[PDB]
Design a protein around this ligand. Structure first.
Ligand SMILES: OC[C@H]1O[C@@H](O[C@H]2[C@H](O)[C@@H](O)[C@H](O)O[C@@H]2CO)[C@H](O)[C@@H](O)[C@@H]1O
Ligand SMILES: [Cl-]
Ligand code: NA
Ligand code: NA
Ligand SMILES: [Zn+2]
Ligand SMILES: [Zn+2]
Ligand SMILES: [Zn+2]
Ligand SMILES: [Zn+2]
Ligand SMILES: [Zn+2]
Length: 240
């Protein structure tokens, strides 16, 4: 069925299990109490920002990051066919696809948020790397830190790379150039190898989760997720 979740931030997070709890959709209004509603299809995992009209500047922190994820966010973990936590260096393959709905108004990014951590579990802020993958953005926002590379080829696409330092973790943001509304079979293992070559990622870290959604500074109504998949593997074959 379809569920609507308007859980107000900044201190509450409304989390909805979709597709047999292979994915969770979170309101995650971590920096605002302004109205934000998500409408979520629990059979398909499709979701929309059905009500939002954020107000504020385009600099600094966004208001919110409503998102879908596989894995663990601040100890809230999916439970079907997860494949995480896993040491980065032990991944056989890691692939994701995301199809979005965008609006030509407001100030937002359309981004993956991928967390790594020194230990396989945490109840809070991961301490390794935050890997962001910006499919698109508008309204004057930019990534955290500084732009350190322009027009590089990684995992079959062209990016600008931004690197920064947070209070207890490193951030690297891959900005698809030009931006787009979807990406198909993105090789995250290739992104991790690149992030490690650029000095942003320790491949001994555990991959905790793969999230996708919208950091919103202004507006936000009508942004959505049409389809989302993440597959992280190896171990070994064994029909039993
Ligand atoms: O505050 C975390 C937030 O930073 C965002 O980037 C800021 C940047 O740090 C600031 O120097 C510049 O003035 O504004 C941008 C936003 O436009 C980053 O985009 C977010 O991913 C991150 O959550
Ligand atoms: Cl920085
Ligand atoms: Na599945
Ligand atoms: Na602001
Ligand atoms: Zn959160
Ligand atoms: Zn961040
Ligand atoms: Zn491309
Ligand atoms: Zn493309
Ligand atoms: Zn690869």
């Amino acid at each position: 069925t379809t569920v609507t979740d308007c859980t107000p931030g900044p201190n509450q997070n409304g989390v909805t299990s979709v597709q047999g709890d292979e994915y969770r959709v979170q309101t995650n209004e971590w920096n605002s109490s302004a109205q934000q509603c998500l409408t979520i299809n629990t059979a398909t995992g499709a979701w929309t920002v059905s009500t939002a009209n954020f107000s504020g500047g385009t600099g600094g922190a966004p208001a919110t990051y409503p998102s879908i994820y596989k894995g663990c966010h601040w100890g809230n973990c999916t439970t079907k066919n997860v494949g995480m936590p896993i040491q980065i260096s032990q991944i056989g393959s890691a692939v994701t696809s995301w199809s979005t709905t965008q609006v030509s108004s407001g100030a937002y990014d359309v981004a993956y948020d991928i967390w790594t951590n020194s230990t396989p579990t945490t109840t809070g802020q991961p301490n390794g790397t935050e890997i962001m993958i910006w499919l698109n953005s508008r309204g004057g926002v930019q990534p955290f830190g500084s732009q350190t590379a322009t027009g590089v080829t990684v995992a079959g696409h062209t990016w600008n790379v931004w690197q920064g330092q947070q209070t207890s973790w490193k951030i690297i943001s891959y900005v698809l150039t030009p931006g787009a509304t979807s990406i198909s079979n993105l090789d995250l293992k290739a992104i991790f190898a690149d992030a490690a070559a650029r000095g942003s990622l320790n491949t001994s870290d555990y991959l905790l989760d793969v999230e996708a959604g919208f950091e919103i500074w202004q507006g936000g109504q009508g942004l959505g997720s049409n389809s989302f998949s993440v597959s992280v593997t190896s171990g070994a074959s064994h029909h039993h």
